[PDB]
Design an enzyme around this catalytic site. Structure first.
Site, PDB file in Angstrom:
ATOM      1  CG  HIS A 110      43.229 -12.172 -44.560  1.00 37.05           C
ATOM      2  ND1 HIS A 110      43.369 -10.964 -43.799  1.00 37.05           N
ATOM      3  CD2 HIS A 110      43.932 -11.991 -45.695  1.00 37.05           C
ATOM      4  CE1 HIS A 110      43.962 -10.069 -44.575  1.00 37.05           C
ATOM      5  NE2 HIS A 110      44.332 -10.671 -45.702  1.00 37.05           N
TER       6      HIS A 110
ATOM      7  CG  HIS B  66      39.930  -6.193 -40.502  1.00 33.14           C
ATOM      8  ND1 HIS B  66      40.763  -5.164 -40.671  1.00 33.14           N
ATOM      9  CD2 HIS B  66      40.424  -6.946 -39.501  1.00 33.14           C
ATOM     10  CE1 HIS B  66      41.789  -5.266 -39.839  1.00 33.14           C
ATOM     11  NE2 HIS B  66      41.601  -6.382 -39.130  1.00 33.14           N
TER      12      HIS B  66
ATOM     13  CG  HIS C 260      40.661 -10.572 -36.374  1.00 31.26           C
ATOM     14  ND1 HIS C 260      41.560 -11.115 -37.236  1.00 31.26           N
ATOM     15  CD2 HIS C 260      40.885  -9.239 -36.371  1.00 31.26           C
ATOM     16  CE1 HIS C 260      42.343 -10.149 -37.691  1.00 31.26           C
ATOM     17  NE2 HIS C 260      41.951  -9.012 -37.187  1.00 31.26           N
TER      18      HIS C 260
ATOM     19  CD  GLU D 175      43.667 -10.832 -34.530  1.00 26.43           C
ATOM     20  OE1 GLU D 175      43.906  -9.616 -34.689  1.00 26.43           O
ATOM     21  OE2 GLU D 175      44.022 -11.780 -35.261  1.00 26.43           O
TER      22      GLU D 175
ATOM     23  CG  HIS E 274      41.446  -5.156 -35.490  1.00 23.29           C
ATOM     24  ND1 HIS E 274      42.235  -6.274 -35.785  1.00 23.29           N
ATOM     25  CD2 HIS E 274      41.247  -5.146 -34.160  1.00 23.29           C
ATOM     26  CE1 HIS E 274      42.492  -6.893 -34.681  1.00 23.29           C
ATOM     27  NE2 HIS E 274      41.924  -6.249 -33.665  1.00 23.29           N
TER      28      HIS E 274
ATOM     29  CB  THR F 259      46.906  -9.199 -35.673  1.00 26.37           C
ATOM     30  OG1 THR F 259      45.725  -9.021 -36.477  1.00 26.37           O
ATOM     31  CG2 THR F 259      47.005  -8.246 -34.518  1.00 26.37           C
TER      32      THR F 259
HETATM   33 ZN   LIG Z   1      42.701  -7.130 -37.586  1.00 22.22          ZN
END
Ligand SMILES: [Zn+2]
Length: 257
Positions: free
Chosen positions: A61, A91, A93, A103, A116, A195
């Site tokens: 992911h 990590h 997104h 996010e 994050h 999330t």
């Molecule tokens: Zn995250």
């Protein structure tokens, strides 16, 4: 299994994880006019001088930069928090294009990406126990915009070729996460959740106001990663963000005016 497609994306998650429709889900839109300035909020204390990064992992992911969290070496304290929270991993997104990827949103603005830094409350002894508690995690969220390159990100970018597909990892020692921070530690904070599945409602979110700038070439490298495993049909790792969830009965506080 869950992911970020048509068939298995965020809008499906609630079938396996009913907490997806819970009362304190993340991310959310930050309405900067409604966020209350809270003069009782303290400055954030980010103590990363002894951080020990160990490894980088493509988990299918995102990619996780993992740290040695077997002692208080990289800790977040202050701010909205009571107690001490140990850095476990960070990590990102990101989007398929620079106009989406974050996010959290700010007055409905989407940034190109969001970092994050995940920390767990030491009073619960380990991460697995912490995520079962309403004050178990503190996640520091940092927006990324595209412009100038972020020198401190480049070591991360240049290892990605070695972890292209799900399940691959690489040694990633001596990486300093201070190089990913903006100048200001002004923040917004609210109670929320992980999330990704299992979406547990265990997070005190701390979202910095000031974005970092990365270059288009940096983010382009994120977008060459793969969600699939080695040898499988290539599906680029892009758009691995959950959209904003309902705020419900929550208040977003600002540390700054
Ligand atoms: Zn995250």
């Amino acid at each position: 299994h869950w992911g970020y497609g048509k068939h298995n994306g965020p809008e499906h998650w609630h079938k396996d994880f009913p907490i997806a429709k819970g009362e304190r889900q993340s991310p959310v839109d930050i309405d900067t006019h409604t966020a209350k300035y809270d003069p009782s909020l303290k400055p954030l204390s980010v103590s990363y001088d002894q951080a020990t990064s160990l490894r980088i992992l493509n988990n299918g992911h995102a990619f996780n930069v993992e740290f040695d969290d077997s002692q208080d070496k990289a800790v977040l304290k202050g701010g909205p928090l009571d107690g001490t929270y140990r850095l476990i991993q960070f990590h990102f997104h990101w989007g398929s294009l620079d106009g989406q990827g974050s996010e959290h949103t700010v007055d409905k603005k989407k940034y190109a990406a969001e970092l994050h830094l995940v920390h767990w409350n030491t009073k619960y002894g380990d991460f697995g126990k912490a995520v079962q508690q309403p004050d178990g995690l503190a996640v520091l969220g940092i927006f990324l915009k595209v412009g100038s390159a972020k020198p401190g990100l480049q070591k991360v970018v240049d290892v990605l070729d070695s972890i292209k597909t799900k399940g691959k990892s690489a040694d990633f020692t001596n990486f300093d996460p201070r190089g990913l921070l903006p100048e200001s530690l002004d923040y917004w904070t609210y109670p929320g959740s992980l999330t990704v599945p299992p979406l547990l409602e265990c997070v005190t979110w701390i979202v910095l106001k000031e974005p970092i700038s990365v270059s288009s070439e940096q983010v382009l490298k994120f977008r060459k990663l793969n969600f699939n495993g080695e040898g499988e049909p290539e599906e680029l790792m892009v758009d691995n963000w959950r959209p904003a969830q309902p705020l419900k009965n929550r208040q977003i506080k600002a540390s700054f005016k």
